[PDB]
Amino acid sequence: QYNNENNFV
């Protein structure tokens, strides 16, 4: 299981 998040502001 691969869990990620990417937020660019």
Tell me what the structure shows.
- The chain is mostly loops and 9 residues long.
- Helices cover 0% and strands 0% of the residues.
- The protein has no helix or strand.
Present the secondary structure layout.
Layout: no helix or strand
Task: Give a brief description.
The chain has 9 residues and is mostly loops. 0% of the residues lie in helices and 0% in strands.
How would you describe this structure in keywords?
little secondary structure, 0% strand, protein fibril
Structural category is little secondary structure
Total helical segments: 0
- Please summarize the sheet with the most strands: none
Strand content: under 5%
Large-scale geometry? rod-shaped
Q: What is the helical fraction, as a range of percent?
A: under 10%
Query: How far is the first residue's CA from the last residue's CA?
Result: 27 Å
The radius of gyration over CA amounts to: 9 Å
Q: In total, how many beta strands?
A: 0
PDB class: protein fibril
Keywords: prion, MicroED, protein fibril
Assembly: monomeric
Entry title: MicroED structure of a mutant mammalian prion segment
